[PDB]
Symmetry: D2
Subunit: 260 residues, 4 copies
């Protein structure tokens, strides 16, 4: 049992035990949710089937959100076992690595901009389009954003724009799907060393600096994010939609804390 | 049991079964919290002792947050049974009624401004000052705000300023008390017909208009707010501090929905 | 001597006397800037040439911001007469019109999303990239956004996401180009019945509701926007960068009028 | 003919040549406004009289915004020479200095809170109340805020709550007085080492950190603020009301510099 008791939730973006999505699925399973999982490529298929089985799940489906056909086929497959379900977790963010390195205006390109927005923002509503009919009243959709949406952060570059697009997507999706009984929210997570840190310069220094100046004096964990995510996909959060909830330890609401 | 299992939480502001604080205490008791209650005047003493006893609580204490002595005496009394505890719910908002009626610049007065800010904003940190030593690591403080803080709303008038002050109070309190292990948040609730609606002109029309244009197509309840409040005072929300969480059905994130 | 007196500013997006960019151009000329103009396509050439002539400009250049080579060629042409200059006004917004009716989730498509973000957001930084070495210290870049970036507005649909991207683009560009002396801002303008209102359902009522609830009790004009734009590209605004300035008469800061 | 050319504006808060209000007054005079000045107390009279004389003004009036009768008497005096006028600059911020060291929860008191909100927030609407019938259509009111209203800044403490109240006051005043032709805005200025830095711990490093992380790579000046203030009280900004304009060089829109 748990406060996600009679709920069936699809979880994207589990790539490793460090993934934010892994922490979310963990917390959701602990709270009684029945889970289903997607995986981007075949390289990831073995790993996700394993994590799903640890969390009581036989439903592991391929989904590359670059492709409308892949999304449709995956929801068609899901419908064979979950004719209806209660929402999904969107934990997919991507820009070509060279976009995330230097001066933003020099780094950004039309293609890097296109990919970053396509994969990190459009895919969320593409997923909602494809399963809109499958959602129960009381369903909840969730995505992961970052402070780069609201502030100019060195090297985050075009992902910052893509996350700002995603946060607007949350609002427009909540406004369109609310009347039929679906809520849509985001968590704006503090930095976490996941595979999304691969190749990012000065990530350790960024983490240290966050730990010093966040009001809770630590960086957040996939367990912190998972607990908030479970809440936001549960009926306990029935009054919250279209909201970007900061799960950052309070980092974003303070300033000039570094000066001791 | 529940996710507030080993937690002792003080609840202010229970005035009637309609109070937001009543809904919060209900949800908190359901989730296993041990509760204590304050009451403003003796007129309210009988009623609150009753609600507290329904929720398994013998701890009902007088507290007029206009008075530093009253706050100190109440925490001294509380310490006799709760030497330490795990946070409190601040559900106190007040401005002299004549402040909340007409054109803001004509209505507001120095004294109405003083009272509104004193009772609705300063009292939150006055309460934290008085019990700071009593708080356990992992404690959480919560207050109730309203969209009037962020937007100019007809007739809300100086309460709008007082709520903006309160939301800044949340941030400064979270920044000062985080390192020692206390989180501080607010819920920005949608309108609810409580005793805070007494004498407010066009409250029914305001409620109707909210129900039409909120993405979830209903107004929020003290049960919605109570569930979010329970979460935000629980260890499930360990990664959230200094945040104003909108529990408004998405009302604040949409615009020009009234035009059908 | 106006407060843009020694400045040379490139103005995109003039398509009619109703355009926001026409109001911006007039104001900037009124304050003594020297101006240059771009036109999207051959359909619009003759009109932009005429408008530029009325404002005393000989510099009228094609620029279709869908294409990197079009932007590059335009700035190479501009460099023949303006080897360095002091910024540009980005007044370009576009999504396929089918994107802007009805339920947002049903209306949006991958291609409609792509185009809206490419044309309305990426093109701002694409332009900055192509002219970065031509920008004098003290330069200012300016774009136009809308409250649909911040709040879910019926029918604005994917343009709201595109504008949210554009406002983030403002911050990232300001952060990147500030050290070399360039400021980057946006105006978030209230609704104006320009060519950008074409085919949009219930535009007249939206203005009417806006005229009723805005604090100043009227909708804004391209004159209002042009005056704020001139300030934002002038040295008077040397302390402002990365900012989205609301020029909507206070509409966005109000709530709960009419019920 | 400057862009405030036919305007009469009352300027509060000139206490030294370093004051933000001194930079605002100079800019407004430069743009052709006629000016009037208030002074808090007898300590400051002689200096404000001198400054007003340098800017060509004979109108120098006492006003202690702690007291309703002081504000009323000042506007009665002003009405003898300016029966109607076009707005005022509110440049008044104050909390007892013990409020602005150390841990916020330990530093704040009921009285320190009262004073900070009374003097820094209520006094803006108190002034508007006392001169409302004297305001010409097209009038503009302006106040100064700081980023401590929006984010928790060490040591700024209760002034951050007071500034958050003041920014809400801007919105509520703009909403109330817009129908009669008055706009109300604020400038959220970056840190400037004025008399308001007196006794504030680590002010020099805060400027140094600010100079490093702000996009424009310098802190702002009273010249930068005065130019934005002149625009905001001029008819050039007729489309802007209820707005908090950040004039901090883009500091607030950045994060994660230095680590
Ligand atoms: N790690 C942080 O600091 C942090 C903080 C806030 C938000 N985020 C965001 O959290 C979300 C999860 O990232 P993470 O930190 O768990 O790292 P991660 O690498 O473990 O998860 C990212 C997942 O995106 C999936 N993905 C990428 N392209 C895809 C595609 N075309 N189709 C389907 N799936 C695709 C990947 O397979 C991966 O599983 C991302 O959106 C990220 O931007 C990360
Ligand atoms: N009802 C709404 O629409 C709504 C929406 C958002 C926020 N709020 C806020 O929620 C909170 C609770 O209000 P409510 O709607 O439950 O109405 P309510 O009247 O039931 O609760 C308000 C409580 O404030 C207490 N109070 C007032 N002055 C006090 C004092 N000097 N000392 C101690 N206690 C004092 C009162 O006793 C009352 O119990 C308030 O802060 C209110 O501003 C209300
Ligand atoms: N009219 C409003 O209510 C309003 C309010 C706020 C912001 N805006 C925005 O202001 C800006 C100007 O819009 P407007 O109202 O003046 O309408 P408009 O139609 O007069 O201007 C739009 C211009 O964008 C140009 N454009 C479109 N695609 C282009 C491309 N691929 N390459 C080059 N140019 C291209 C068009 O030629 C046109 O000149 C837009 O960004 C719009 O989103 C409009
Ligand atoms: N200096 C900064 O870093 C900074 C940045 C942003 C905003 N501000 C704000 O700008 C405004 C002007 O401050 P400043 O930096 O020019 O310092 P300042 O000391 O030169 O100006 C403050 C003025 O407030 C006046 N004042 C105080 N109490 C008063 C009262 N009861 N009645 C009448 N007048 C009273 C004072 O006489 C003084 O003239 C303040 O509101 C300040 O909070 C300052
Ligand atoms: C913090 C922070 C993060 C983590 N986080 C918030 C994200 O959203 C990270 C998305 C992200 C998207 N695409 C990526 C990668 C990461 C890198 C590996 C992947 N293999 C890749 O090729 N492309 O990334 C940053 C980048 C620059 C500066 C700061 C940060
Ligand atoms: C919505 C809405 C609310 C409810 N809510 C958000 C609040 O915060 C209400 C605080 C509030 C404070 N003080 C009050 C009262 C209410 C009135 C009864 C009490 N007996 C009194 O004397 N003084 O109040 C409004 C007032 C005007 C316009 C809209 C609203
Ligand atoms: C307000 C408001 C506006 C004006 N505005 C702020 C904009 O940014 C309008 C961009 C926009 C982009 N692409 C468009 C068009 C318009 C339509 C004609 C053009 N010929 C077209 O084919 N495609 O448009 C709206 C649309 C729906 C709801 C509200 C509004
Ligand atoms: C930045 C910054 C400022 C400047 N600034 C934005 C303000 O608004 C400063 C208001 C302020 C109000 N009251 C004060 C004083 C200052 C101190 C001298 C005066 N003589 C006094 O007695 N009381 O002050 C800070 C204080 C702590 C941390 C950061 C800052």
């Amino acid at each position: 049992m748990g406060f996600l008791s009679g709920k069936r939730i699809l979880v994207t973006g589990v790539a490793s035990k460090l993934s934010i999505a892994y922490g979310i699925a963990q917390a959701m399973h602990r709270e009684g949710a029945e889970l289903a999982f997607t995986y981007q490529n075949d390289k990831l298929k073995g790993r996700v089937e394993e994590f799903a089985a640890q969390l009581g799940s036989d439903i592991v489906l391929q989904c590359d959100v670059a492709e409308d056909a892949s999304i449709d086929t995956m929801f068609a497959e899901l419908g064979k076992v979950w004719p209806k379900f209660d929402g999904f977790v969107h934990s997919i963010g991507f820009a070509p690595g060279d976009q995330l390195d230097g001066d933003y205006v020099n780094a950004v390109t039309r293609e890097g901009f296109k990919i970053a927005h396509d994969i990190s923002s459009y895919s969320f509503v593409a997923m909602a389009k494809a399963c809109r009919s499958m959602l129960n009243p009381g369903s909840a959709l969730l995505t992961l954003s970052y402070l780069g949406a609201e502030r100019a952060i060195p090297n985050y570059n075009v992902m910052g724009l893509a996350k700002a697009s995603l946060e607007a997507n949350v609002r427009y999706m909540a406004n369109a799907m609310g009347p039929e009984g679906v809520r849509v929210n985001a968590i704006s997570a503090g930095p976490i060393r996941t595979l999304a840190a691969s190749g990012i310069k000065d990530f350790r220094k960024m983490l240290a600096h966050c730990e010093a100046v966040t009001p809770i004096r630590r960086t957040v964990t996939i367990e912190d994010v998972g607990n908030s995510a479970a809440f936001l996909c549960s009926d306990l959060s029935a009054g919250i939609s279209g909201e970007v909830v900061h799960v950052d330890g309070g980092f974003s609401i303070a300033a000039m804390n570094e000066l001791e």
